[PDB]
Amino acid sequence: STGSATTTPIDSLDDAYITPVQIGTPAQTLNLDFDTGSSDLWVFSSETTASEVDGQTIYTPSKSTTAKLLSGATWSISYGDGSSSSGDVYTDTVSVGGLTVTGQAVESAKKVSSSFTEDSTIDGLLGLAFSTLNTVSPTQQKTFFDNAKASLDSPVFTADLGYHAPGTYNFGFIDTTAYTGSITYTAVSTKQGFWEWTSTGYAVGSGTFKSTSIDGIADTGTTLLYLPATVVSAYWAQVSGAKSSSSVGGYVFPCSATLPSFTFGVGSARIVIPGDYIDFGPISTGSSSCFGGIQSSAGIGINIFGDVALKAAFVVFNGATTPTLGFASK
Ligand SMILES: NCCNC(=O)c1cccs1
Ligand SMILES: NCCNC(=O)c1cccs1
Numbered sequence: 001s002t003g004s005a006t007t008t009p010i011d012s013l014d015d016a017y018i019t020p021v022q023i024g025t026p027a028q029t030l031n032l033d034f035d036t037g038s039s040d041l042w043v044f045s046s047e048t049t050a051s052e053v054d055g056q057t058i059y060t061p062s063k064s065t066t067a068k069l070l071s072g073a074t075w076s077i078s079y080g081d082g083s084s085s086s087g088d089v090y091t092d093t094v095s096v097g098g099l100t101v102t103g104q105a106v107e108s109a110k111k112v113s114s115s116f117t118e119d120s121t122i123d124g125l126l127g128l129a130f131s132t133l134n135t136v137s138p139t140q141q142k143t144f145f146d147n148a149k150a151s152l153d154s155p156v157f158t159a160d161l162g163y164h165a166p167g168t169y170n171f172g173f174i175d176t177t178a179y180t181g182s183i184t185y186t187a188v189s190t191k192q193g194f195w196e197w198t199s200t201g202y203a204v205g206s207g208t209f210k211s212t213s214i215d216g217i218a219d220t221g222t223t224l225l226y227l228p229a230t231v232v233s234a235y236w237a238q239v240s241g242a243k244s245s246s247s248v249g250g251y252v253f254p255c256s257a258t259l260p261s262f263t264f265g266v267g268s269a270r271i272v273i274p275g276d277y278i279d280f281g282p283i284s285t286g287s288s289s290c291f292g293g294i295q296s297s298a299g300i301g302i303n304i305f306g307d308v309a310l311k312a313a314f315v316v317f318n319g320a321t322t323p324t325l326g327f328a329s330k
Pocket of ligand 2: 013254280282
């Protein structure tokens, strides 16, 4: 089997991407944030505290003939950005882009943190990291990809995120029309439950490439590119008037700037992030200070190849017995 779904930026900055997902019988379509950095599929629901719902579409398990309470199971998750959610669990039929899984754990939120409530465009998350990170207790649950894998034509999914445009998530096949050149594959560690890999180095603009190992995760659920402070300082040093602002919480730059590109290495291959991809717009409405798309990971404890990086590539998440990542230009 295969599936193919379009993913759409939630706003003009690409702060996140939403992908429609069919849950239940008859289908209830929710717009979920596909997150290769977490492993829970959770939704706003008829159980969510009413004051914490503001415009999201909810899953109502009592209206699905295939929904079953997963008795005793609860979940609770805290993300790296400080946001959180928790609740109970149903199993139900979940389809993405024509690919159906029966008996998928659908984690129903009873509580969500303010940043979820305040984002009316995201109806929940669909985790695509390794199932070892799933938070359901006392019986850990599998991701949608892990449940689908055996049925897929190839045990893979691909992320093709757009810059200020829609893109695609495919499951079970590699669309050879969607990228240029060849795909370079690189090793993955699953030891922390993430799609963790080692980049071979970086360049700033037309500068020389620096060969250096940068361990990090491929995380579609993180907006920005988070790298070591040395690398980030080298990038922003090429932008007149850029500075790290403790008050704003990262590097800012004059909105009048033309940003340089940023290149990262994948083995002997190179992915180029155009400068425009690194502009996240005014820090507040009407400001002439703009927020940078490359930020330090020093406060995180891991480097994160988020959407800024991933949207410059066609990315293969290879879930073979030994997982690997693939990157191609496009
Ligand atoms: N801070 C806004 C609410 N949190 C989110 O939208 C998340 C997306 C992916 C991981 S957390
Ligand atoms: N240098 C121009 C300031 N940047 C912007 O207005 C936007 C960034 C992303 C969408 S608009």
